[PDB]
Nucleic acid binder design. Structure first.
Ligand SMILES: [Mg+2]
Ligand SMILES: [Mg+2]
Ligand SMILES: [Mg+2]
Ligand SMILES: [Mg+2]
Ligand SMILES: [Mg+2]
Ligand SMILES: [Mg+2]
Ligand SMILES: [Mg+2]
Ligand SMILES: [Mg+2]
Ligand SMILES: [Mg+2]
Ligand SMILES: [Mg+2]
Ligand SMILES: [Mg+2]
Ligand SMILES: [Mg+2]
Ligand SMILES: [Mg+2]
Ligand SMILES: [Mg+2]
Ligand SMILES: [Zn+2]
Ligand SMILES: [Zn+2]
Lengths: 114, 55, 68, 100, 96
RNA sequence: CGGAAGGGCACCACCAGGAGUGGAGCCUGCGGCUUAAUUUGACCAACACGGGAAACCUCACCCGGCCCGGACACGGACAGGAUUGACAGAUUGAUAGCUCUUUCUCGAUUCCGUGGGUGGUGGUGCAUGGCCGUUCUUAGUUGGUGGAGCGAUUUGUCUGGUUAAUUCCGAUAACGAACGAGACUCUGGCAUGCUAACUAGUUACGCGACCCCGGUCGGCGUAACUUCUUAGAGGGACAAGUGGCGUUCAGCCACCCGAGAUUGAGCAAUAACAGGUCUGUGAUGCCCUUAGAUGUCCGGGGCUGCACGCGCGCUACACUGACUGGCUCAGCGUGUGCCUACCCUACGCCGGCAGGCGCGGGUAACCCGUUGAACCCCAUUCGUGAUGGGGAUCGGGGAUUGCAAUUAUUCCCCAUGAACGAGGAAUUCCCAGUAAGUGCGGGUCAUAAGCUUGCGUUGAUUAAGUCCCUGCCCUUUGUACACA
């Protein structure tokens, strides 16, 4: 690499990247029961896995919202066009995932029930 | 020329140069290892980054 | 909070009625004569005229001053 | 010819699995390979106050991140190197390839 | 905001060719990084897309220093009418 | 809960000690004074704390000046202009057309009033969340079944022994359990057994240099290996064995063999506080300002101001010392940044000096660097003198960084040469590679540690106990308290 950044700060930068992506999707997909993100980093290919519950809801109609999310990620982080691909997965037995149930409990709390 | 001196003061160093990438705060920051984040944010995102209190 | 010096009122830039008509001169025939000068600069080459002050001409687009 | 592949990882178990898989692949192809060396671990240590404000007893945290780097030397054509490296890779390990 | 007509057209055309556009929450930016062919300062970008959100055309999200704007169909038709475009053309977020 | 009683624990308590503090100067923080502000929170569990070592920014306070960065909706104002900018000349602090005369411009974005917003390190931590601190890192807590009681509840959760531990044994209307502790993870120890290594080495081999066959080389290359180095799977210690105390149970002492016969840290909980953070935030309710701004930007001041008191620290009060030369040994780490404009340094010249000038190495077990650190060790000078201890105050000069040092950023030289003769009342921390002495990394950084977080070197006396003091926990008792 021309920049040839050192590994000590390369790992830290990657971790900050994961935290920033995690919080961004937490704000975006709160209604969708978002639970976490797995990033599969490879040379020339970057597959990012979004673990949620309502995968159809988070995919949207004809994948419009996942498309614009891919464009958002590419523009914000400066990745080459087409290098990143977002995939949506459904977590089996989502009751055991605290984050998803916490989001559901938060939405139930704001709903108005006791 | 308002734009000639609206932000003409040099921001090449000092606390007002570097700011938290999450809070836009200029206090309790860490520039070591290129964190560029406040201590509160670092504690909040330590697990996400990879820092774990092994010892 | 109370003040002692009166506030500095904003500059009210006055309007001019048909200011375009003051650049040329009216003739009955199909000919054109230009009264004031025109800026020979690059960006404003042959369309933007210059100011006509009491002692010098000026163009604000490129900050060109022609003193006498 | 004298290819050298560098693997940096945060998890010891994953990195050892990856290096073991690569050397086993070299053994299957019957290629002369140097033993897996271990660079000294890099421990990025950060100490911060627990309290967001300044009150309370002075209590400090110890957040450390461990990075392990292992490199392997092999004697094979670059096409063989690309074939071996393109498969059986854990996502958490960063891979570097050097010809010299 | 005294946004020049050229900058407004540039913002609209980029928003119409790419359905989303990001911008850091930083007024003290010389020019926008995503589009640098023309000046179009980041302040103008922020205020223009703030206006689009205000009149119910675009949707805003925030991640620690940046805004993300998502253009709905009602904003698509408004942008098409403003730029004098046919209904056939669609932004990159619609077609495959 | 007690201003009652009995047990238990704790070097944030004591015994014996060690090093200190409080005694002097200085750095820093708090109160007070003063001031346009010398803003603010905190006042065991505030006081070198807000990672708060502030010339600019940070800054929230004050002295003055710009911008709207007042979206959107509604009614006017007109392509026979809505209205932005503008060097001259005055004014200012700045070439802010911010303002006053004078006109050229920009091209429906605007502007004028009204709803509606919007911003705020503004108030409210006595509304909050989260985090953190404290009780308390002591050891406490809760079901199931089963006995007692009409019931709320109680026994289990205990008379004693033992343990760092409600940790266990053991009597027992209790038996089985769960959280905690423990366990666990990381860390240091040692393995000539395993895996490996030209980004680490070792042993030999061959040259090169030097001294009287041999000796040295971090001088150069190569035949084996991982003992030394780095890092992976395992092993290894368990009160295992012996002699004693102890119902012969738990457990404790001494010892042989043994790398160890108590390495340190992390997480640490049914609960409570009206402890702190609204100044960490695009986490936030309400209130307030919102254009003559509590929003933002610019110039300057202040956060350091000094009759005084207090706290955390540095330097020392000297002969086990100071000064001058010689010799000699480490590990923790970091090092060219998204915006970001700022890296760590070998080498050769100039110069006493900080420092300046040139080509090189390093995104790193690769270069600084075998990190030639100090203490300490060796040899002279000083001779009990506030003395060559001491470096406060202060003058002159020389450099670095920064847009900018004045209230002297920091560094260097000459010189001036204060108190302090081991410190009262009172009081702090500690028990093994411990304290203490000493130096070195990271945080803050354009410039920078007299703080803190870690590391390395030398490295001890006391002591294997207690409730005397101080706290704090359990039990008994009392209650007219139960927002206790
Ligand atoms: Mg700050
Ligand atoms: Mg104790
Ligand atoms: Mg003070
Ligand atoms: Mg005071
Ligand atoms: Mg500032
Ligand atoms: Mg402030
Ligand atoms: Mg503004
Ligand atoms: Mg109203
Ligand atoms: Mg918000
Ligand atoms: Mg402002
Ligand atoms: Mg003296
Ligand atoms: Mg002086
Ligand atoms: Mg005391
Ligand atoms: Mg009574
Ligand atoms: Zn932050
Ligand atoms: Zn002109």
């Amino acid at each position: 690499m021309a920049v040839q950044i050192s590994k000590k700060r390369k790992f830290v930068a990657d971790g900050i990247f994961k935290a920033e992506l995690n919080e961004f999707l937490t704000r975006e997909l709160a209604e969708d029961g978002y639970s976490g993100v797995e990033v599969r980093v490879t040379p020339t290919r970057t597959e990012i896995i979004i673990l949620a519950t309502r995968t159809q809801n988070v995919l949207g109609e004809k994948g419009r919202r996942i498309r614009e999310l891919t464009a958002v990620v590419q523009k914000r982080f400066g990745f080459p066009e087409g290098s990143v691909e977002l995939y949506a997965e459904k977590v089996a037995t989502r009751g055991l995932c605290a984050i998803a149930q916490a989001e559901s409990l938060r939405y139930k709390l704001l709903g108005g029930l006791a | 020329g308002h734009q000639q001196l609206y932000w003409s003061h040099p921001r090449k160093f000092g606390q007002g140069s570097r700011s938290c990438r999450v809070c836009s705060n200029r206090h309790g920051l860490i520039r070591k290892y290129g964190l560029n984040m406040c201590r509160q944010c670092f504690r909040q995102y330590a697990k996400d980054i990879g820092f774990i209190k092994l010892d | 909070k109370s003040y002692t010096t009166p506030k500095k009122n904003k500059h009210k830039r006055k309007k001019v009625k048909l200011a375009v008509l003051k650049y040329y001169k009216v003739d009955e025939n199909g000919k054109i004569s230009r009264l004031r000068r025109e800026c020979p600069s690059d960006e404003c080459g042959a369309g933007v005229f210059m100011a006509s002050h009491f002692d010098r001409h000026y163009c604000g687009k490129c900050c060109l001053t022609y003193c006498f | 010819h004298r290819i050298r592949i560098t693997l940096t990882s945060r998890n010891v178990k994953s990195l050892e699995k990856v290096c073991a898989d690569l050397i086993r692949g070299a053994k299957e192809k019957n290629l002369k390979v140097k033993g897996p060396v271990r660079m000294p671990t890099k421990t990025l240590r950060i100490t911060t106050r627990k309290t967001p404000c300044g009150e309370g007893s002075k209590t400090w945290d110890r957040f450390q991140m461990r990075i392990h780097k292992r490199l392997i030397d092999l004697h094979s054509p670059s096409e063989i190197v690309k074939q071996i490296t393109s498969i059986s890779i854990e996502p958490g390990v960063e891979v570097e390839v050097t010809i010299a | 905001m005294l946004m020049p007509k050229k900058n407004r057209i540039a913002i609209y055309e980029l928003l119409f060719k790419e359905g989303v556009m990001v911008a850091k929450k930083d007024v003290h930016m010389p020019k926008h990084p995503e589009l640098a062919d023309k000046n179009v300062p980041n302040l103008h970008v922020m205020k223009a897309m703030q206006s689009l959100k205000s009149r119910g055309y675009v949707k805003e999200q925030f991640a620690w220093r940046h805004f993300y704007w998502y253009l709905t169909n009602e904003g698509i038709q408004y942008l098409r009418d403003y730029l004098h475009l046919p209904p056939e053309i669609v932004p990159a977020t619609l077609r495959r």
